[PDB]
Structure 1
């Protein structure tokens, strides 16, 4: 088995994209009870990466860099290991669309994914 398969190559972490022939868990993180593991990723996502259904349904409403560098609690330190930036905040979901509940349930399945995983 492998645990650090991501170390075999070098990819842009900002533009990271998992593919149907690459381990999604290696690209981003593995499900677990900690934020550093990955609090989002259903058992269907891990099977195909970007070839997974509904993936673009999340990407459509996604926020641009403006709020990310606007109210997301921008704070970093310049350490010898390199800079470490953090982001904290909240946003209201797209309540005006007829697909609002579908988006809420879709997203919730990935969050509470580890709750139904073996």
Structure 2
């Protein structure tokens, strides 16, 4: 929890020991908050049983910079590198139905937390 924190935010790895809320703050509606993860994913980070099945949609560094609309924002809160894009799921892949089911579980989960 002490060593996994010293890393700059975007190089942190969320585990059971250092969780998604600890690593990346609360799920939230705010423009700079994250909104992915049910309670199990939040609590387990990359120890989640199905992490590699979510991992496979994460961009490489090259892809992060190659695909995205990249931007800069200078505000009193400081200077920010902005990013947006879109990743096409391969609907010809055998696990396509599962991929959709898994990612639905997590997207905006926090809004139906008890």
Please say which structure displays the higher CA radius of gyration: 1
Runs of 5+ in structure 2 lacking a partner? none
Q: Please state how far the C-alpha of 1:100 moved relative to its aligned partner.
A: 0.8
- The number of residue pairs the alignment matches comes to 114
Runs of 4+ with >4 A deviation = 5-9, 77-83
Query: Retained in 2: the 8 A contact 1:77–1:84?
Result: yes
1:66/1:106 CA distance change after superposition, 3 Å: same
Normalized per residue, the structure richer in helix is 2
- Give deviations 1:32-70, integer Å, cap 9, x for gaps: 223422210111112222211101111124332233222
1:35/1:54 CA distance change after superposition, 3 Å: farther
CA distance in 2, matches of 1:56, 1:86: 25
Q: Please state how far the C-alpha of 1:87 moved relative to its aligned partner.
A: 0.7
Over the aligned positions, Cα root-mean-square deviation in angstroms equals: 3.1
Runs of 5+ in structure 1 lacking a partner? none
